[PDB]
Design a protein around this ligand. Structure first.
Ligand SMILES: [Zn+2]
Ligand SMILES: [Zn+2]
Length: 76
């Protein structure tokens, strides 16, 4: 679903964002992530902390982006 999609950090994605993952407002994909230009898809199962993949294809977000996905997934 589109539930899970996040705007990627245009700076990170070109090697130049100097913000902790946990203080930047956009996603920083572990370099194995499926990024559809601008958008990564968040890990449904990681949210419930229930992911178990070593190298994931769907981003495991930091806290703030996780609650921002909880908010987004309360909006029917
Ligand atoms: Zn950034
Ligand atoms: Zn995962």
């Amino acid at each position: 679903t589109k539930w899970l999609t996040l705007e990627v950090c245009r700076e990170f994605q070109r090697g130049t964002c100097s913000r902790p993952d946990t203080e930047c407002k956009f996603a920083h994909p572990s370099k194995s992530c499926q990024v559809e230009n601008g958008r990564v898809i968040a890990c449904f199962d990681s949210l419930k902390g229930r992911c178990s993949r070593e190298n994931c294809k769907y981003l495991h977000p930091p806290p703030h982006l996780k609650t921002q996905l909880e908010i987004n997934g309360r909006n029917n």
